[PDB]
Design a protein around this motif. Structure first.
Motif, PDB file in Angstrom:
ATOM      1  N   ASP A  10      36.140  46.488  39.932  1.00  0.00           N
ATOM      2  CA  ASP A  10      37.407  46.922  40.313  1.00  0.00           C
ATOM      3  C   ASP A  10      37.407  48.461  39.945  1.00  0.00           C
ATOM      4  OD1 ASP A  10      39.963  47.420  40.705  1.00  0.00           O
ATOM      5  OD2 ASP A  10      40.774  46.714  38.693  1.00  0.00           O
ATOM      6  N   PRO A  56      49.703  50.566  29.018  1.00  0.00           N
ATOM      7  CA  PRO A  56      50.856  49.693  28.947  1.00  0.00           C
ATOM      8  C   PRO A  56      51.364  49.197  27.665  1.00  0.00           C
ATOM      9  CG  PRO A  56      48.878  48.269  29.501  1.00  0.00           C
ATOM     10  CD  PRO A  56      48.727  49.796  29.881  1.00  0.00           C
ATOM     11  N   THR A  87      39.748  50.454  41.515  1.00  0.00           N
ATOM     12  CA  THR A  87      41.042  50.986  41.929  1.00  0.00           C
ATOM     13  C   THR A  87      41.287  51.822  40.418  1.00  0.00           C
ATOM     14  OG1 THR A  87      42.207  49.031  40.743  1.00  0.00           O
ATOM     15  CG2 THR A  87      41.790  49.060  43.422  1.00  0.00           C
ATOM     16  N   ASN A  90      39.845  44.234  29.395  1.00  0.00           N
ATOM     17  CA  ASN A  90      41.297  43.870  29.547  1.00  0.00           C
ATOM     18  C   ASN A  90      41.034  42.518  30.407  1.00  0.00           C
ATOM     19  OD1 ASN A  90      43.534  43.203  31.379  1.00  0.00           O
ATOM     20  ND2 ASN A  90      44.473  45.003  30.239  1.00  0.00           N
TER      21      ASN A  90
HETATM   22  O1  LIG Z   1      46.215  50.204  35.092  1.00  0.00           O
HETATM   23  C1  LIG Z   1      45.464  49.346  34.843  1.00  0.00           C
HETATM   24  N1  LIG Z   1      45.143  48.335  36.184  1.00  0.00           N
HETATM   25  C2  LIG Z   1      45.517  48.839  37.381  1.00  0.00           C
HETATM   26  C3  LIG Z   1      46.740  47.887  37.944  1.00  0.00           C
HETATM   27  C4  LIG Z   1      47.204  48.274  39.222  1.00  0.00           C
HETATM   28  C5  LIG Z   1      45.805  48.110  40.225  1.00  0.00           C
HETATM   29  N2  LIG Z   1      44.540  48.615  39.718  1.00  0.00           N
HETATM   30  C6  LIG Z   1      44.363  48.811  38.258  1.00  0.00           C
HETATM   31  C7  LIG Z   1      44.747  49.040  33.559  1.00  0.00           C
HETATM   32  C8  LIG Z   1      45.472  49.022  32.388  1.00  0.00           C
HETATM   33  C9  LIG Z   1      44.870  48.438  31.217  1.00  0.00           C
HETATM   34  C10 LIG Z   1      43.573  48.298  31.184  1.00  0.00           C
HETATM   35  C11 LIG Z   1      42.716  48.296  32.646  1.00  0.00           C
HETATM   36  C12 LIG Z   1      43.427  48.597  33.677  1.00  0.00           C
END
Ligand SMILES: O=C(N[C@@H]1CCCNC1)c1ccccc1
Length: 150
Positions: free
Chosen positions: A110, A118, A112, A102
């Protein structure tokens, strides 16, 4: 009618996705699954940069053109103790996990949680994103565009 998608941290936007707790994704399904995450199959260069930022798994997954395991630490049961982006050379079988990339994710580690799928479309499946920390996000939809994958 359920699909579980275990996802990882993103490293330079690259992350791992395992479907239903086993190697179960075809190359066509992998492209569609990444598209549902507004993502694409990583290129070898993208995966190498993710590896340099700290990404490793112990699972075969698709990238563009190959099936690989990114390895940082040599482990005998993960890619035969190799380090680097280990490329699968010989296999009888076609179903693996997938990696996705992404472009809007942070540049480095990252860890998180993933909180959405989406770009999934309308459909009947309860799709649950399962993070490593157990947190879950579920939505009804579909992401598979090829009948042979359903
Ligand atoms: O949900 C995703 N990212 C979140 C957004 C809010 C903060 N932390 C990560 C996400 C979606 C699609 C591909 C990769 C990641």
């Amino acid at each position: 009618n359920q699909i579980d998608l275990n996802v990882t941290c993103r490293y330079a936007g690259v992350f791992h996705v395992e479907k239903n707790g086993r190697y179960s994704i075809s190359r066509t399904e992998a492209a569609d699954l990444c598209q549902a995450f507004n993502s694409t199959l990583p290129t070898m260069d993208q995966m190498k940069l993710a590896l340099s930022k700290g990404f490793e798994t112990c699972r075969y997954g698709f990238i563009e053109g190959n099936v690989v395991i990114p390895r940082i630490h040599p482990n005998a049961i993960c890619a035969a103790n190799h380090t680097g982006v280990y490329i699968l050379v010989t296999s009888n079988t076609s179903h693996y996990d997938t990696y996705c990339f992404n472009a809007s994710a942070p540049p480095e580690e990252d860890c998180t949680s993933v909180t959405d799928l989406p770009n999934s479309f309308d459909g009947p499946v309860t799709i649950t994103i399962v993070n490593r920390d157990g947190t879950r996000y579920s939505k009804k939809g579909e992401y598979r565009t090829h009948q042979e994958d359903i």
